[model samples]
Target: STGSATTTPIDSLDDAYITPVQIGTPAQTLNLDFDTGSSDLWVFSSETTASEVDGQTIYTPSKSTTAKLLSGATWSISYGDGSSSSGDVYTDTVSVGGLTVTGQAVESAKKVSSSFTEDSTIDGLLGLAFSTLNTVSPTQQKTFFDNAKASLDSPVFTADLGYHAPGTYNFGFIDTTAYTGSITYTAVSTKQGFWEWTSTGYAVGSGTFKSTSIDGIADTGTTLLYLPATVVSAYWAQVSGAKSSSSVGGYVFPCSATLPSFTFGVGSARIVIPGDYIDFGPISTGSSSCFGGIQSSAGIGINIFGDVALKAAFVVFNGATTPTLGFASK
Candidate 1:
């Protein structure tokens, strides 16, 4: 069976995108962040503390006949900045677009951090990464994608992220019309439960392609692209008045400066990110300097091909026994 869903940026800068998902028997619809960077289908729910509930919708399991508590099961997840959420688990009917899973594990939040409560736009997160990263105790649960994979016509899903516009997430088959040129396939390493792959190399603007193996994850949850320090510095060097600012905490340049386009290789295929996309908006309300979308990955451990890069191409997460990733310019 094939299924599709629309993804829309929550704010002007495309800080994050949201997709509507239906959970429980009564079909309580909630907008969730489809995060490919993690592996837990958690949500703001009735179990969450009242103080932690802001304007976000909460999933009420008691109202759904199809909901069953996974007794003794619990989960907790931590972010890089120390913000986190933890809760119990429930097995219920969950549907994304038109794809339904009879007993998808839904982690109900008992406590949430201030960061989550402050973001009223998102109800929770639907992890698309490998199930091995699931945080459920006793027995780790499978994600919505994993539970629905067997019923799909093809065990694959595609991400067509947009630049401050609506994009698509399609399951079962690849949409040929969504991209230009032939698809380029690459091996994926699920060892760390991420959609990790290696890029052939990269180039700044019209410069020559550098032959180096750059490992990174295709993460939709992240807002910017992060590469090795040297590669990031190379891109910034091309722009006049660009430098790493201690106060801004990243590389920034004068908003009036002409930015250079960035290109990365997928096998022999090259995907180019527009120069305009690199000028990641003003640093402040009326500031003349702007942040760089491509930042140094030195502190992140692993490089990330985030929204800044993903939006430039159509990506496929192949769910075969031996997983692979496919890329094509869109």
Candidate 2:
């Protein structure tokens, strides 16, 4: 049978927010915060504090005939940013697009802070990224994917983050047509959910930087792709006429010239970050120097390849069989 169809328009007001793929048999719209830093899907509810629940969308179980709240189970989640929320556990008939999966696990946060509550445009978060840190325990294990795995066409899930436009966050089974060429699969490391790797060396402006080896993890939860100081400075220096304004330090160069293409060695695999990403404009103060593809995180230890980099590749997180990440092409 054909799957159900559901489409959410991307709200232009919140450039950072993506319209979530409402999940349920007759899918109820839930605003999701897509993060690669963790693995979980949570939403706010009417039970939340009035002050903290203002402006945000809350899942009202009473409104959905198919909604089912888990009896007596409580769930609380915290983020690296030190933001957190807590609530009860629940399961319901969830749907995405044309696919309907039953007994889907969901979290309803009751006591949310203002930071989470004020985003009238943003609903909740969809963490497709991998991380060893999981709220779902053995007793409470099997989140949305864990529960729906058995029903999937293949025991796999793929996210096609469409270009920066409306309907970019559609989730569900992979759309093979979205990508060109054969899909390349990389075996996931048994260590952790973070996509970790070592750089063979650095190449800037077609010139290789000697003794500049690097290693770290790639995360989608982060917005900017962070690199080592030497590598980042070296790249900035190469962009001809690329002048760094004091206002925007690492953001480097105006949107004038065609920025150079840079690649990093992931073992033997070379991943390229295009020019538009290189000239990542300033989104905030003290963040002007931040480039889309590369930035210097002085005090921050691990080098992180964030969404700016992840967007260029197709990634799959397989938590069912074992902890692993599969990388393919689009």
Candidate 3:
């Protein structure tokens, strides 16, 4: 199956940060950030008169014969980062992987910041993560998935994010030919919107963090996983002869040595974090210390299990059946 399908180019934002397919065609691709934190697909529109729209990729409905506007419906969305965008409603035949869905409701931003506009490559964001946090209207719920789910060959979807290489993020169906053996499936959690798990504890190499019991929420929108201060310190304590340096902040250990592997016990699942993920990349920070992927964010609103964690396992957001987050092996 892998050989049968052709690879599509996914725009990478940061080092490990990959944006979903841009909304438009290849000639004028719109860089879109696939966010699970929030629902509602939004894109910059031609109506935007704001001077800041200089470099931003605007979705020109006129160019696309399939594009449609929603007349009077307006939309507004705010991110945790304190950034916000407001615009009118529009519908168009959005294309992804050569698949086209007609009349999909999309937010057409008329005003946005230079930071947003300057990111010219970024055209819009796709909210395919979950449904509990969906911003879609009551009448138009399940817009994205509903359109694509039934058409998919398999019920499963997988995101293979690259740590150093360009990661492959797929939708609809997962090509099982890439891996050997059966895919593992974890039961869903009957909680709110996010993909959450009650982690028993963390272990570094042979040593385990005995004192700290932490909970993790897997989020595709977030970049890194945040752990409690106590847990982070406990993890660092396990690294043999681990030295603390302020240059790279707390819990960053040297990468020269064979860094111990970390395992997060969630129910019966033992999710492993590779050494490379811990060390991250070699940079100005003199210490090659394992970058302590887990950092201090105790008081932060929600403890996130970002792409780093998601890449470790296959995740499922079962909003179609009920409000639950499911997990499985890659």
Candidate 4:
């Protein structure tokens, strides 16, 4: 009842890190995207039409005697990238990474946007964001972490993401042996239901660290780092042949380009993302046009420190009276 489990990346992890979880009595296993940007433990379920599922494993609530429909309650959600899903709600037992919680609200998706249905790699989403962001209609629902918080030795989780390598998401426990250097801490302002915070500023390569108070969200669900458009423009200016490409939805650079390192500030503590990491590879396969990983957050309003940013450091998502974020190098 008091322990933690590790979440390893799937075969195609460059886009997102996925993990497994069990639901219902017989234990229907589902691959879930553990997202910190939103809170809603939705799964591709038997409720969805088989054709619309596009080969995803579905959760059968009826198989579990304990599963109960939350009468008249429904749930729906939309992503900034235009992906969305909606369905009725059910109360059931959910277990993941050695952690278990009864009465977990599971959203059974009867409808989903092509963004989700098209991605056969992911079966559902396991929300790690604040429960306040949950989408159950008539009543909100607590996340697995929140419901199980009382049983955790520490009310926190750590994200250790890697580049095309094995990574882990540790829940309710901190592994001192997982990281090196002091874990720099900073206060998190969570009005947006995200792990939002202000950065001291940033710099490129070995250049002088700039000073600016930039507010941003640490989102594991997203793929790249999004900063102020002007900031991204300035950075791209220094890189030869890097240009904003309308067709690509962001800036693009030469495939052979040696990109510059970008740094993020967390108080006085700074974490630098390498230039190579910033190059997200060619616009598509067999193309020399590579898109810059750091793009503009102009239309998005808030900057996002996605996997591209979080993977550079070991991140501690602390849930306390005043939740604070802790960062460390791998």
Candidate 5:
């Protein structure tokens, strides 16, 4: 069987995307963030710390007959943004669209960071990265994708992200109409437990495609694209007032500045991100300076092809025995 669900941007800037997921016996629905950067399916639940629960919905394991506590199992995970969550584990019936998986490991949050507590729109996160990255301790568990792959028509999932609109996530098959031209395939390194791949090079606007290899991960969970200092500075140089602002926390430019489009090589194909996509909205309310979606990943060690890049193309995460990544213009 296959699954298809609509994923909607949480805000006007497309900070993150969320999709509805059914969990437990009576099938309590929770809008979960579909993150490809990490592997730990966790949710805000009745067990979560009371002080941490804000406006987000919670899943009550005791309400479902099928929900069972995974004895001696616990999980903890933190993100690049400093947000974190930790809790005990539970195996319950989980479903997305029509695809169902029984005994799916659902990490029930008992504690969460303030960042997550304040986000009312997101109840939890559904991790799509390799199960090897699962933070579960003692007895490790498989990710939702890893468990559902065997029953799927094809062990694959595609991410179609929208700028400020809604997109779709399709499992088991790819939708040809979702993208234009042929997909450029690239080998993925699962050793890092991420959809890590290397790009031939990048070009700032239509200038030139420098022949260089950049190692990065295609992370839908991330909002902005982080590249090396050379690539980031090159792109920012095109904007008249662009500068790396420590006070503002990243590269910022005049909202009225003329921003150039960014293009990255995927095998022989190139994925071009429109100039407007790089304008990541204002730094603050009523602020004239805007943040750049493409920032430097210098201290981070690894570059990331985040939603800034992912939204420009149709992405395929092939979960075959040997994983691969496919990108095509949308």
Candidate 6:
């Protein structure tokens, strides 16, 4: 069977897009962040401390006839943003769009970080990453995509993320109308458990595309495009008022400055991200200073081609024998 779901931006230019998913019997619904960067399917649940839940909805096993506790099994996760969750597990019927997986591992949260506790809109996260990265202990947890693949016409999925609009995530098939031109294919390295890819080089503006090799991952959960400090400085140098600002905690520039487009090479295809997209938004409370959407990824180990970079094109995640990434202008 095939499945697809629409994703709505949390804001006009939201850092992430979220979708509604059903869990357990009678279909308890939760609006979850669909992330390709992590591999744990966790949620705020009955097991969670009431103080930590805030205004988020909770999933309870006792409320569903199909929910079964997985004795002695546990799962925990911590994210780069300082958010975390952990607790015991249950196997339940989980569905996203029209895709359904029976006996899917659902990590119910007992502890949650302040970052997650304060966010009332997100009830959970639906990880689209490889199942090998699941945080479950004793027994490994398979992702929803992994369990649904065997039943799909083709083991391929596509992410049609858009700017200030609703996008679609399609399973077992690709939407031909979602993009323009041919999708250039590139090999993906799953060694890191993320959609890691390499850019042959990148350039700011019409300057010669430098031969700088940047290894990074396509992270839907990440909001900014993070590269090396030198690369970031190189781009900032092109802007008149751009500089590192301690108050802003990153590179910031005059909102009126004319920013240049950034381009990266994937295989032989070049993806050009418009300048307007890099100006994340105004930083000062009522000032015109805007923070650059691109930052330095030095401490993170791997560079990140985040939503700022991804929203510039259409993306496809193919689960063939050798999983590949496909990209085209949207």
Global lDDT of model 6: 0.87
- Candidate order by TM-score, decreasing, is 5, 1, 4, 6, 3, 2
The lDDT, on a scale of 0 to 1, for candidate 1 is: 0.93
Superposed Cα deviation of residue 272, candidate 4 (Å): 1.4
Model 5 error, position 233 (Å): 0.2
| lDDT, candidate 1, at 261 | 96
Q: List RMSD in Å for every model shown.
A: 1.1, 4.5, 4.5, 1.4, 0.7, 1.4
Give the per-residue lDDT of model 3 (tens digit) for 288-309: 5455566666657667777666
Q: What is the lDDT for 16 in model 5?
A: 92
What C-alpha root-mean-square deviation, in Å, does candidate 1 show against the real structure? Answer: 1.1
Q: Cα lDDT of model 3 overall?
A: 0.59
Query: Per-residue alpha-carbon lDDT of model 5 for 66-185, expressed as tens digits?
Result: 999999999999898788999999999999988899999999999999999988999999999999999999988999999999999999999999998999999999999999999989
How far off is residue 80 in model 2, in Å? Answer: 2.8
TM-score of each predicted structure versus truth: 0.98, 0.75, 0.76, 0.96, 0.99, 0.96
- Candidate 2 vs candidate 6: the lDDT winner is 6
Q: Please report how far candidate 4 places residue 28 from its true position, in Å.
A: 1.2
Of candidate 5, the 10-residue stretch with the lowest lDDT total is 75-84
Best by lDDT: 5
Candidate 2 ranges with C-alpha deviation above 4 Å: 1-19, 23-26, 129-132, 136-139, 166-174, 195-202, 209-218, 239-258, 283-293, 297-301, 318-329
**Each model's backbone clash number:** 0, 20, 6, 0, 0, 0
lDDT of 4 by residue, 1-330 (tens): 444555555554377777888899989989899899999999999898667789788999999888999999999999878899999999999988768899999999999998888888788999988999999989999998889888888888889888777678887877888888889999898788999988889897778888998899989899889999777887898799999988888899998889998998888889989887787787888999988889999989899999889999999999977899999877
For lDDT, candidate 1 versus 3, the one ahead is: 1
What residue pairs clash in candidate 4, if any at all? none
